[PDB]
């Protein structure tokens, strides 16, 4: 039996359209997970190819999470450290945020959606090391999902690397992955550190899928990342009234690409919705600003659908 909710998959594609006619946008994709079981219940595109598999992207953004898990996991940083995360350069190439932080702890890094103390942290790493933990996500590494033009993506051998490349590829830019892609990697931070397979079946036990993190990182970086959709954050325009959740934003220049990826319960989560808008010219082009309403009606409404019991009283 296929995976898909069809009441999900309606309900993706009605709020995906007119997020795409609002905007005026070239077009759209919404992936909707399970997040304990990685079958795809909803996979909703404008008309034309399917995008969610076919179109590798720059995550932006949403790849900061990643980075972030990865030097609290192997004990490069801790959540009382204070970074300076002033603006540099390496050589001519400069590393900036939207503002100044002059210094930043780890959940004001991910609060704040920080490129620069996100660069820091991947810096902390060789070259090899980063390079084996993005293809471990999956990143350049094909689904196999049946769709004919499915996208392998992008990652550059390790060798190849100058330093600003590192610094750019751990804030999303120069590397790319489907939106599949990318919302399969977040069952990595959704299922306690062990990221799934993905299925277009009905799963009735949770696959055996692989480790990435421990147990103890991924709930601590899902913890930070409900500051995203909290006042304060990037992401406010995500959040799902009765529900903590636990987000990220993203807007990456191709003429933007907005994104808008999160899952929720936060503390045991049960889906995951990812929203991509592919070149709004009306009403904004930021990922919080023009994927964040079309999120946040998905994932409230899969939330009911699914029978989800709100965890904090409804305002």
Do not use: L
């Given at each position: 039996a296929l995976s898909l909710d069809q009441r999900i998959q309606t309900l993706a594609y009605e709020e995906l359209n007119k997020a795409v006619e609002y905007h005026q946008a070239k077009a759209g994709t919404v992936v909707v997970l399970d997040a304990r079981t990685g079958e795809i219940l909803a996979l909703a595109n404008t008309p034309g190819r399917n995008r969610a598999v076919t179109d590798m992207i720059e995550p932006g953004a949403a790849i900061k999470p990643f980075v972030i898990a990865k030097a609290l996991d192997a004990g490069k940083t801790d959540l009382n450290e204070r970074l300076n995360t002033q603006p540099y350069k390496i050589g001519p190439s400069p590393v900036r945020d939207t503002h100044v932080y002059p210094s930043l702890d780890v959940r004001g890094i991910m609060q704040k959606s920080s490129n620069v103390g996100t660069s820091k942290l991947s810096a902390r790493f060789g070259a090899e090391e980063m390079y084996d933990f993005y293809h471990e996500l999956g990143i350049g590494v094909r689904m196999h999902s049946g769709f004919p033009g499915e996208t392998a993506g992008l990652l550059r051998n390790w060798r190849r690397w100058r330093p600003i490349e590192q610094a750019t590829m751990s804030f999303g830019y120069g590397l790319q992955l489907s939106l599949l892609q990318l919302a399969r990697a977040y069952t990595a931070l959704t299922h306690d550190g062990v990221l799934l397979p993905l299925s277009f079946e009905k799963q009735a036990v949770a696959p055996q899928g692989k480790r990435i993190f421990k147990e103890s990182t991924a709930r601590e970086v899902r913890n930070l990342m409900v500051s995203v959709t909290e006042?304060?954050?990037?992401?406010?325009?995500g959040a799902v009234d009765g529900f903590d959740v636990g987000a990220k934003t993203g807007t990456a220049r191709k003429k933007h690409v907005a994104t808008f990826i999160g899952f929720a319960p936060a503390k045991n989560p049960r889906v995951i919705v990812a929203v991509t808008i592919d070149e709004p010219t009306a009403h904004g082009y930021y990922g919080g600003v023009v994927a964040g309403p079309p999120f946040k009606k998905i994932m409230g409404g899969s939330l009911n659908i699914l029978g989800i019991s709100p965890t904090k009283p409804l305002t």
């Open positions: 006042p304060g954050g990037t992401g406010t325009a």
